[PDB]
Amino acid sequence: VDRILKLCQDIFLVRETRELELEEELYAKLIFLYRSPETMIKWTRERE
Amino acid sequence: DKVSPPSLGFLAGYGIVGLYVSIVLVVGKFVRGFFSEISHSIMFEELPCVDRILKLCQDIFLVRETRELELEEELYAKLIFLYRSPETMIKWTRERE
Amino acid sequence: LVVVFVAGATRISIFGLGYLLACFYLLLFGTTLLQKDTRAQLVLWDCLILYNVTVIISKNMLSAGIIWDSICFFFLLLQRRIFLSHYFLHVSADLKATALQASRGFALYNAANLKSINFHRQIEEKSLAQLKRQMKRIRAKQEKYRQSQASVIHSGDYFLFESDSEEEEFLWVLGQATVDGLTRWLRAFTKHHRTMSDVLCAERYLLTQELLRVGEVRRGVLDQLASELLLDRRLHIPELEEAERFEAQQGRTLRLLRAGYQCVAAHSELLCYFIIILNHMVTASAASLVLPVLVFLWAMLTIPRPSKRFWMTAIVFTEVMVVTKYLFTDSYIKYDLVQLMALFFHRSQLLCYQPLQRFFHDILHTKYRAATDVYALMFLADIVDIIIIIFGFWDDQVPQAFLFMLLVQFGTMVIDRALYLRKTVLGKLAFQVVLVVAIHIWMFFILPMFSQNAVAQLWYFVKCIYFALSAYQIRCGYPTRILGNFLTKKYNHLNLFLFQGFRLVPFLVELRAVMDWVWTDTTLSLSNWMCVEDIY
Amino acid sequence: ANIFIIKCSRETEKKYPQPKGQKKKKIVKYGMGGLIILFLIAIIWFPLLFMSLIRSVVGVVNQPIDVTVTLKLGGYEPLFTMSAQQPSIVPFTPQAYEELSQQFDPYPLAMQFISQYSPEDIVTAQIEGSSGALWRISPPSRAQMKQELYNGTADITLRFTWNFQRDLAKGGTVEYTNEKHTLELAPNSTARRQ
Amino acid sequence: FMSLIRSVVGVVNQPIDVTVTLKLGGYEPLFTMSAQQPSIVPFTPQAYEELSQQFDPYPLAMQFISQYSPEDIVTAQIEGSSGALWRISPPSRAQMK
């Protein structure tokens, strides 16, 4: 889940820095990621 | 010794707080029903543009009123297939310019 | 001194008043009394034993029950024998040494807190650089994606999802073990005062050994191994190594209680506040109500060190209170004397020293603090508070005031959370100064029989803890990264169990995410906030 | 109906487009968040109000409007009886509270018992020494009780029976409270000779 | 099952016992008597017409009389003479005298 958890920690960070448009464009990336199940498997692998 | 006017207490000191904690617990696991479980149904909940589904549903109502039944059950066929596959919702719910 | 006071206590005030004056004089000048000369020590001790053998025969002139007078008399003769003796002379030279070395220890404490302040300044600079790097990288990626986009929330596309890892990365051994772990924990708590005591003790020993004939230089001892450090690179006195080996030999519980005494000698102030609260907690209606308000006000607000003159006023007030309670008891006087003797213990162990409200109010806003934030302990103490109040329902007047108190408590908790989230400090100070006097005025109407009083006083004590932690937060003052999960910092299985616990208590997840969506600066909806914090 | 809700929430967007990244909804946050927090706090708290506001049934005092006392020696006939009412009953004054503080000094259980009740929970009934009637009894039964008290070589019981009755609109689901008390007299004893 | 528990209208309470006493002074109850349904007359509609008649110009009395059922008012009779004597201590008779 690391590539989602990084996105959410950055959503908290920009939420604390007040750069609002990257709040709502990381929220945009999150909503799109969850909405399409197929792009979750292309995005939640592991590395080696 | 003074006389209680109604003596309606109806229970002992121990074994009544149980009812209150049951009530709070049930209301709680009601109110976490839809305020902390809206994750699975995000896809259906949010669509940027719905016009190509809403036209399909208004036509389903129309053919439902004209009695041409086989286009009722083949627009219902198109609807069920559209909902079943999430991927074809993103290929179908864009906007135009 | 304590035995004399208790001899003055347990009997009727026919002549015992004089011994309160003794604890007025004796404890005030005790260090100086030891530091004067044998001639005047024996003069004043002879005066005191003369007044004792006066008052015994005076209590024979009424026309067994004098036991406290007899024991104190025995103690005075024993101390007089001590004070004659030529063995104590070098212990007196020890105390002469403790008169000299105070300013070096003051400068050492100054250097240690300067080291703390610049370690927290360096931590804050590193963390600000890290956060700036994060925002730089995020903005550069979002500019890249709008760049290859052009070649408002509901606009995402698959090309946002490139694999960009490019940028990121049998029982007695158990008993001995448990008591050795407990004394290791106490050593870990004591370590810094232990080191300070050790270095000062070594310096004192060296000075005293040198002080066989004369003593005239201070910087000449500062180089008998440069000005302002904390280093230890010097000689080795075999007497000190021998004492360290002797203490090292002990390994049983004696070391446990030794480290316990070193702990209660290190903090010293905490048990003063503890007993200042504990005297009010038991059988104190309105007498010790005017003292504790200003303990919070003066002590915990100005600077980390308690105010220069708060201690003197506190001790004089305690003595005045004990003397006033003589309109003519058993436990009351015993708790006021233990409070007094704790105050004088802390004053001796300290050994260092409308147009002015705005001055310290401004110094509260000069931003020299280490910026340590501990909200989770306020909120944990208030949750334990509400558990205690609600379980306290296990004549028929105190439940209505417990339940109005319950509602005010809920409101206060919500307001404190809101205050914590806008990063404001002055509002937290106003909330402090209102709530302390509100709860102390509420400490009238508990009683206009035993269980109710005990649970109400436990409630009072735990919100005294809450006020103390609130003043700690006023002192340290809101580090500029307060928005994170309180229980999430490291992914341990204990942490997972505690998080799944925290989402089990009713009405505590949705309240957190609603107060966060209302008071935090965000541009989403309420549902959007809920979705984000549940995905999280 | 869900696509209709979404389409309506899109069309109420299109008539009032919002600027990107800003307009952080200052008042509506306080509005909806205060509504939510007070709703949840009320759901938490009001259960102990309609839990508590049913327990305010402390009570009221029960001044006995009727006092009856009878001495019944033997089974032949009740010898003494009498009753009295609030005219011959004195509800206690705080002077009698100070008296009960005085009159029971060295007994701590009695001290706590006397200090337990209210001032107006103890009364003092008076009883006329003489009878209000005669000892109306069958002369056969009078002769039988006479011969029992003279020479009936067995024991004899006397029931002293106090009794009270309170009022009813004050509450209380029992009204005629009492208890007997027994004394035993020997065959040809001293009180038997009296 | 909200309503069919509320069908508890009531029934009439004809008093089977009537007792009346005149007690002058604390010395002795002078007059007493009781009676039962043999000496009680449950009212007849003739007494309903009488209560319609006997309380003409008082509207509160009119509504009070028209409130109850016919069979909710009775008329007890009492013997003028005593059923016993004034059995009393001659000391108490002298004191009341």
From Swiss-Prot, chain E:
Q: In a knockout, what does one observe? A: Embryo lethality at midgestation with defects in vascular remodeling. Conditional knockout mice in inner ear hair cells show no auditory and vestibular defects.
UniProt signal peptide: none
Q: According to its UniProt record, in which tissues is this protein expressed? A: Expressed in bladder, colon, kidney and skin. Also expressed in bone marrow, liver, lung, spleen and erythrocytes (at protein level). Expressed in myoblasts (at protein level). Expressed in red blood cells. Expressed in cochlear inner and outer hair cells (IHCs and OHCs) and vestibular organ HCs.
Question: Where found in the cell?
Answer: Endoplasmic reticulum membrane; Endoplasmic reticulum-Golgi intermediate compartment membrane; Cell membrane; Cell projection, Lamellipodium membrane
What is annotated about its quaternary structure and interactions? Answer: Homotrimer; the homotrimer forms a propeller-shaped Piezo channel with a cation-ion conducting pore. Heterotrimeric interaction may occur between PIEZO1 and PIEZO2. Interacts with PKD2. Interacts with STOMl3. Interacts with TMC1, TMC2, PCDG15 and CIB2; the interaction may be part of the MET complex. Interacts with MDFIC (via C-terminus); the interaction prolongs Piezo channel inactivation. Interacts with MDFI (via C-terminus); the interaction prolongs Piezo channel inactivation.
Q: Which family does it belong to?
A: Belongs to the PIEZO (TC 1.A.75) family.
Miscellaneous remark of the record: Piezo comes from the Greek 'piesi' meaning pressure.
Instruction: Give a short account of what the protein does.
Output: Pore-forming subunit of the mechanosensitive non-specific cation Piezo channel required for rapidly adapting mechanically activated (MA) currents and has a key role in sensing touch and tactile pain. Piezo channels are homotrimeric three-blade propeller-shaped structures that utilize a cap-motion and plug-and-latch mechanism to gate their ion-conducting pathways. Generates currents characterized by a linear current-voltage relationship that are sensitive to ruthenium red and gadolinium. Conductance to monovalent alkali ions is highest for K(+), intermediate for Na(+) and lowest for Li(+).
Q: What is this protein called?
A: Piezo-type mechanosensitive ion channel component 1
Q: What gene name is listed for this protein?
A: Piezo1
Span covered, complete protein: 2209 to 2305 of 2547
